[PDB]
């Protein structure tokens, strides 16, 4: 298919945000490169939740000021999202920061019966990530590099 990087990225980010909001792992089969995407999801469960615990106050402080309740507000977040790159630095930390921000928003949407807004939220996040940093992601081997970046000694 056309633009496989975007499709895969949306698949990963969609399922993570929805799983974070509902607390239930998805079981619907994934598509091309889904095996790598499964490992990236598990990586996000570990790393993403670690970021959320250590910085929940900062993230909650943002939600308080944002006061988003509908689809329009969700899309309006793109202006905020791009600031993870504001200093000219790009790394998997900034991307995990952005996705973790999405997780806090997705959890909120759940609590006000806006699960339908999680899908356009994931599209907005994937837009900021892929539409502005595609060159960086390709050079970093995409989600396979993501998985290898967070490899734990175990």
């Amino acid at each position: 298919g056309s633009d496989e990087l975007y499709r895969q990225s949306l698949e990963i980010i969609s399922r993570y945000l929805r799983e974070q909001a509902t607390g239930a792992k998805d079981t619907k089969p994934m598509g091309r490169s889904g095996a790598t995407s499964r490992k990236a999801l598990e990586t996000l469960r570990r790393v993403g939740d670690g970021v959320q615990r250590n910085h929940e106050t900062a993230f909650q402080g943002m939600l308080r000021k944002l006061d988003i309740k509908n689809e329009d507000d969700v899309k309006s977040l793109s202006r905020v999202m791009i600031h993870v790159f504001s200093d000219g630095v790009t790394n998997w930390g900034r991307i995990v920061t952005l996705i973790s921000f999405g997780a806090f928003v997705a959890k909120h949407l759940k609590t006000i019966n806006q699960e339908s807004c999680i899908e356009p939220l994931a599209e907005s996040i994937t837009d900021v990530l892929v539409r502005t940093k595609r060159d960086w992601l390709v050079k970093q081997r995409g989600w396979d590099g993501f998985v290898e970046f967070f490899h734990v000694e175990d």
Partner: peptide
């Protein structure tokens, strides 16, 4: 003085904190 602009700066600040971890 916009809340959205203020939040954007906080998001950058938070990202720089997270660089120290991952």
């Amino acid at each position: 003085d916009k809340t959205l602009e203020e939040i954007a700066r906080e998001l950058l600040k938070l990202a720089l904190e997270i660089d120290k971890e991952i």
